[PDB]
Amino acid sequence: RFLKVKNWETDVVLTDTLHLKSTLETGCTEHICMGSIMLPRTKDQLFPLAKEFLDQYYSSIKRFGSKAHMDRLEEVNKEIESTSTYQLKDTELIYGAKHAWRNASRCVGRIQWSKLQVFDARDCTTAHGMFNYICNHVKYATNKGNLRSAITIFPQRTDGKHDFRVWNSQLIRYAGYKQPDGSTLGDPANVQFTEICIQQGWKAPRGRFDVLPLLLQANGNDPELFQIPPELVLEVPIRHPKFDWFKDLGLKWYGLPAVSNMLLEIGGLEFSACPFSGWYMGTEIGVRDYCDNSRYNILEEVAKKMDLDMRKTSSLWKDQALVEINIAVLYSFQSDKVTIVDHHSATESFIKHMENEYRCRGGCPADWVWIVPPMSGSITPVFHQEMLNYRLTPSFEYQPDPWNTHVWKG
Amino acid sequence: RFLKVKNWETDVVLTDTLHLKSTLETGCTEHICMGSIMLPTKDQLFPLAKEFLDQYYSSIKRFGSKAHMDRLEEVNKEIESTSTYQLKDTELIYGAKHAWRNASRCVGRIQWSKLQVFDARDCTTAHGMFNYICNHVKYATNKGNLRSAITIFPQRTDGKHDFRVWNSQLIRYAGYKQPDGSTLGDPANVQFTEICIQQGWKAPRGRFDVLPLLLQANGNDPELFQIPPELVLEVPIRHPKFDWFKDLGLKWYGLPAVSNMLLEIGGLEFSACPFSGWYMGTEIGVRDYCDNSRYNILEEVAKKMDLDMRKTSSLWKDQALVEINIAVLYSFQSDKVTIVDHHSATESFIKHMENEYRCRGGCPADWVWIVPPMSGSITPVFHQEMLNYRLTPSFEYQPDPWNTHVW
Numbered sequence: 001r002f003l004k005v006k007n008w009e010t011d012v013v014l015t016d017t018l019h020l021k022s023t024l025e026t027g028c029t030e031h032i033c034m035g036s037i038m039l040p041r042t043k044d045q046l047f048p049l050a051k052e053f054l055d056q057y058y059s060s061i062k063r064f065g066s067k068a069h070m071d072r073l074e075e076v077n078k079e080i081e082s083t084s085t086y087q088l089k090d091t092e093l094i095y096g097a098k099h100a101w102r103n104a105s106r107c108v109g110r111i112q113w114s115k116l117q118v119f120d121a122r123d124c125t126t127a128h129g130m131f132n133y134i135c136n137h138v139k140y141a142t143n144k145g146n147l148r149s150a151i152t153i154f155p156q157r158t159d160g161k162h163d164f165r166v167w168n169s170q171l172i173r174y175a176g177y178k179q180p181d182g183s184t185l186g187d188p189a190n191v192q193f194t195e196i197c198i199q200q201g202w203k204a205p206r207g208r209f210d211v212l213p214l215l216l217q218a219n220g221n222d223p224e225l226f227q228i229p230p231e232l233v234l235e236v237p238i239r240h241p242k243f244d245w246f247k248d249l250g251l252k253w254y255g256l257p258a259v260s261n262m263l264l265e266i267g268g269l270e271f272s273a274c275p276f277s278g279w280y281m282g283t284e285i286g287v288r289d290y291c292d293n294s295r296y297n298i299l300e301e302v303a304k305k306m307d308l309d310m311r312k313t314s315s316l317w318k319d320q321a322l323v324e325i326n327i328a329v330l331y332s333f334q335s336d337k338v339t340i341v342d343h344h345s346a347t348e349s350f351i352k353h354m355e356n357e358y359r360c361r362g363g364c365p366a367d368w369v370w371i372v373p374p375m376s377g378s379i380t381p382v383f384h385q386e387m388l389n390y391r392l393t394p395s396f397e398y399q400p401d402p403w404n405t406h407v408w409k410g
Numbered sequence: 411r412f413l414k415v416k417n418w419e420t421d422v423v424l425t426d427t428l429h430l431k432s433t434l435e436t437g438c439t440e441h442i443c444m445g446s447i448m449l450p451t452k453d454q455l456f457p458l459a460k461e462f463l464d465q466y467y468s469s470i471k472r473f474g475s476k477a478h479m480d481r482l483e484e485v486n487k488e489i490e491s492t493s494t495y496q497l498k499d500t501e502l503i504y505g506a507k508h509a510w511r512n513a514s515r516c517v518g519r520i521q522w523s524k525l526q527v528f529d530a531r532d533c534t535t536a537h538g539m540f541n542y543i544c545n546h547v548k549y550a551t552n553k554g555n556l557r558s559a560i561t562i563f564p565q566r567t568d569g570k571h572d573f574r575v576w577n578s579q580l581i582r583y584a585g586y587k588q589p590d591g592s593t594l595g596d597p598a599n600v601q602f603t604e605i606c607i608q609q610g611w612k613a614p615r616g617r618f619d620v621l622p623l624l625l626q627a628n629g630n631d632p633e634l635f636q637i638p639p640e641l642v643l644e645v646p647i648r649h650p651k652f653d654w655f656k657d658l659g660l661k662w663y664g665l666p667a668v669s670n671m672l673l674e675i676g677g678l679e680f681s682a683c684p685f686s687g688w689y690m691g692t693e694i695g696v697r698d699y700c701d702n703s704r705y706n707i708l709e710e711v712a713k714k715m716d717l718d719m720r721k722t723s724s725l726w727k728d729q730a731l732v733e734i735n736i737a738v739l740y741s742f743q744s745d746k747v748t749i750v751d752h753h754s755a756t757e758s759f760i761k762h763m764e765n766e767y768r769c770r771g772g773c774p775a776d777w778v779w780i781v782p783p784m785s786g787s788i789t790p791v792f793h794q795e796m797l798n799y800r801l802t803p804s805f806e807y808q809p810d811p812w813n814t815h816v817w
């Protein structure tokens with residue numbers, strides 16, 4: 001089967017065949033679309049998953065059907081039979097992590113997918129060991145502001161009772177503190193996690209931008225607290241190129257976006273701790289982190305200081321302040337030589353990437369709802385681009401927050 | 411099978427049961443989501459008629475009544491006899507209002523029960539169509555105090571006698587390809603404009619020429635008619651801060667009136683059903699003015715603003731986009747022509763969704779279309795999960811008539 005997608009700005013039509021390789025389900029049916037819903041192993045099932053992956057790996061290196069390919073299938077089959085699991089070769093792990101990124105339909109940054117530094121941490125055994133690996137990742141990826149994409153991969157799941165987990169949602173994130181008066185100091189997104197850290201013994205500074213400690217679980221054991229060395233945490237004070245009062249808002253953000261709570265699936269194996277990092281698209285900070293009502297919520301204060309007419313929404317004071325904040329974020333990162341991409345550049349690159357994938361790969365699964373930036377949607381080319389969303393493996397998946405599932409040793 | 415939608419800004423969860431009544435297909439499967447794709451005999455008719463009258467009689471608290479059964483029987487008798495049936499006025503009004511209620515791509519549905527229905531089923535000629543349409547335009551315009559309206563022409567019979575308005579909207583601007591390869595006016599309308607010229611229209615070849623109506627009655631060849639200029643309310647666009655903005659020479663029309671969709675009620679098909687409301691500002695300011703394939707004015711505006719256009723990261727496009735949208739809203743408000751901003755419209759839609767969940771068990775909504783084309787996440791709908799599904803009565807797309815018409 002062939003499915004076509006059209007771009008309504010350019011009339012370019014693309015043809016998707018890659019969707020034929022999807023196995024996992026979307027949530028939709030012929031009767032309902034769940035496109036805007038945020039969240040819609042015995043040996044038995046494992047060998048087919050391993051075989052499908054190894055077939056893809058061997059095809060990619062142009063060795064499909066070779067003796068090396070056949071011997072590797074045989075080796076994995078026997079390993080599964082006798083140990084109930086198997087270990088990936090370093091080459092397969094690298095290929096697999098790159099492809100999980102390539103396959104991430106919610107990621108606008110995938111033009112970069114083949115440039116990913118993979119740190120193999122499968123020899124790690126303790127939370128202190130994880131801490132060391134994570135510091136090294138942060139220092140490597142940060143590279144004094146010249147950000148480099150990277151992923152660190154801790155040991156895979158065995159019986160599900162010995163999981164490695166980073167309890168942080170991102171490696172670098174700001175604390176949030178609910179006050180007795182119902183207001184929040186710092187990042188309201190992180191209140192629950194901040195409370196857990198405090199309970200575990202963290203001495204909270206109780207400021208507006210306190211970098212959270214790492215809370216690290218090795219081998220199914222109770223998690224342990226570590227402070228990332230402050231000298232490894234690059235931050236950017238936010239100022240505006242024209243508005244000199246902007247700096248006195250006291251805003252800053254960190255340079256390194258590093259997701260630490262997803263699960264990486266390769267060949268049926270599950271890597272429950274696989275922190276990965278890239279660089280920011282400006283709107284992530286300037287639109288969502290700063291301007292969501294449920295986050296730092298700065299629109300009002302910004303608009304006030306700009307002296308916009310705030311008595312009617314139709315003055316578009318919110319839209320005006322939003323643009324100025326996003327200018328400030330890009331200006332500040334660029335002035336400090338910390339890698340960042342604006343939403344125009346990022347989406348234009350994504351379209352070129354998507355066209356290339358259709359041509360070379362037969363498709364590019366993409367989730368329009370997430371790919372379109374949260375401001376200025378239709379002045380970016382992705383708004384006008386039809387997309388097809390489906391699930392390919394290797395993949396990054398959500399997993400339940402570990403405080404909800406962890407069995408405490410005490 | 412009972413489904414939850416969450417709002418991620420407010421944590422409010424709603425449960426949807428209405429989707430279980432859904433009839434048509436979405437385009438998606440369990441393997442692939444097509445959420446972002448724009449266009450994804452006698453035997454069929456009685457089940458369709460029944461499903462509709464059932465919901466109608468239920469709505470008036472007379473389900474299972476003598477009058478309900480009598481009506482089912484009468485329509486059944488009529489389909490058996492004539493292979494079609496005629497809706498009572500009450501059913502037609504109910505059906506039109508519900509097609510709007512069911513339109514998953516419409517953010518303005520809080521208004522759904524306030525719709526003036528003009529029954530034009532007695533219309534026989536294209537001149538009669540013209541008269542009905544001028545009356546609709548004048549009623550809906552109401553000197554700038556806009557009122558939602560639909561005019562319903564005769565239903566499809568054998569399909570070779572269709573009523574069609576050939577225009578995509580009752581009021582739209584012409585587009586002309588230039589000798590030098592550029593486009594004057596609205597590029598969206600080039601093909602239709604050529605059909606008008608081919609049919610005889612004398613075009614002024616300007617940037618904002620209101621198109622003539624091309625009206626097809628009873629499957630006959632369509633005819634040209636010009637809407638009395640005095641019935642076409644237009645708004646010159648100026649900015650409350652930038653005095654040079656008026657020098658751009660921009661205007662738009664006050665009345666958004668879709669004329670190329672098909673209304674389906676109880677299996678009957680109304681191929682000419684022009685309907686109108688009032689604009690949300692972004693429709694004009696973001697899409698009509700700033701789409702690359704539309705008037706595409708961003709560059710000229712940015713230049714007049716003296717912005718640094720050398721780098722995307724200056725956000726000059728974004729800055730200019732906001733200023734255009736400020737001017738659109740200011741100009742309509744200053745001339746007392748009803749308009750809604752995207753903040754107000756989306757706030758209203760959330761309230762409407764809440765009403766619908768509470769009173770009806772759901773509200774089909776297409777997120778990709780409901781979220782405004784600028785400032786997405788600062789509107790509440792961005793954070794609102796929506797379920798998309800197709801209920802009837804409905805408005806549907808239909809093929810452009812020129813590809814289908816036998817001359």
Ligand code: HEM
Nearest residue numbers: 101104106107108109112149150276277278279280281396
């Ligand atoms: C190189 C620069 C990159 C940029 C600019 C970028 C951009 C983004 C953005 C803006 C999002 C949406 C985040 C949100 O709204 O919550 C995202 C999602 C994602 N990206 Fe990237 N990305 C980059 C690199 C990476 C890398 C290195 C990986 C993994 C190896 C990755 C995998 C993902 C995944 C899995 C998601 C989905 C996250 C979720 O569902 O919460 N991306 N990307």
Ligand code: HEM
Nearest residue numbers: 510513515516517518521558559685686687688689690805
């Ligand atoms: C009262 C003021 C109204 C507002 C502010 C409003 C708002 C909108 C907007 C912004 C769109 C999207 C248009 C686009 O992006 O191309 C839309 C779509 C639509 N609305 Fe409305 N609406 C209104 C009244 C109505 C009425 C009276 C009807 C029918 C009786 C209607 C039925 C529809 C339908 C069927 C669509 C989908 C059109 C398509 O798919 O091309 N709406 N609405």
Ligand SMILES: Cc1cc(N)nc(-c2ccc(CNCCc3cccc(F)c3)cc2)c1
Nearest residue numbers: 038039257258259276277278279280281284
């Ligand atoms: C590697 C990378 C680069 C970049 N620019 N951004 C990201 C990134 C940032 C934040 C997030 C978090 N996304 C929200 C997660 C979430 C939260 C609540 C419900 C959901 F379904 C999902 C994911 C990826 C990751």
Ligand SMILES: Cc1cc(N)nc(-c2ccc(CNCCc3cccc(F)c3)cc2)c1
Nearest residue numbers: 448449666667668685686687688689690693
């Ligand atoms: C009654 C009403 C009020 C209002 N504020 N806006 C509208 C409205 C405006 C424009 C349109 C046209 N929609 C785009 C049609 C289209 C064009 C090309 C491909 C597609 F899938 C769809 C529909 C409804 C209609």
Ligand SMILES: C[C@H](O)[C@H](O)[C@H]1CNc2nc(N)[nH]c(=O)c2N1
Nearest residue numbers: 036037038369370792793794795
């Ligand atoms: C309900 C809705 O799906 C939700 O708010 C989504 C919309 N699009 C998004 N897009 C991105 N990139 N990130 C997000 O968190 C969201 N949130």
Ligand SMILES: C[C@H](O)[C@H](O)[C@H]1CNc2nc(N)[nH]c(=O)c2N1
Nearest residue numbers: 383384385386446447448778779
């Ligand atoms: C491809 C994509 O579905 C398309 O550009 C859509 C996106 N959302 C939209 N939303 C509205 N309201 N109107 C539109 O025309 C579109 N176009």
Ligand SMILES: [Zn+2]
Nearest residue numbers: 028033438443
């Ligand atoms: Zn879908």
